[PDB]
Homo-oligomer: A and B are copies of this chain.
Amino acid sequence: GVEAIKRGTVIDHIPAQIGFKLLSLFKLTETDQRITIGLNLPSGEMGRKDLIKIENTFLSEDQVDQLALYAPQATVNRIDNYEVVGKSRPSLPERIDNVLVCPNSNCISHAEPVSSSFAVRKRANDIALKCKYCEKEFSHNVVLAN
């Protein structure tokens, strides 16, 4: 293939510059197996894409839901014994828990031992995320302000 793994995931079609944030977000560096990261590769329709290839490793649920909110274009390909057993494009979940931080400075989530949680309303314009606690709804742009 353009590289090759017996078992593993290849996350293709990642937007330019998101690739590295993803590596960091999903703590994919804490591993011992082969990883190939192709930063800023061609992708005809949108020119630059990033490509991560983790050998003999698959993404847990949460990461695939996060992936939906960070890189919707991306396609997770389940490879087993070089066969692309599956190719799946993420869809937005109902709720995102414990990685998002609430824009509301006076939220209770900040000061107390609780996992944050956000409800995902897919607005026609963008993703509206509603905090579990303070009940404010925010633009996903605001919420993902890195």
Q: Which of A's residues lie within 8 Å of B, judged by CB?
A: 1-3, 17, 20, 23-24, 29, 31-41, 48
Contact = CB atoms under 8 A, between A and B. Distances in A.
A38 B40 contact: no
The oligomer's copy count stands at: 2
B37 A37 contact: yes
Given A37-B39, A39-B37, A32 B48 contact: yes
Given A32-B48, A35-B40, A37-B37, 8 more contacts: A2-B36, A32-B40, A33-B40, A34-B39, A34-B40, A34-B41, A35-B37, A35-B39
A3 B29 CA distance: 21
A38 B48 contact: no
A38 B34 CA distance: 7
A23 B20 CA distance: 9
Contacts of A40: 31-35
Majority secondary structure of chain A interface residues (helix, strand, loop or mixed): mixed
Nearest to A20: B29
Contact of A36 (B34, B39, B48): B39
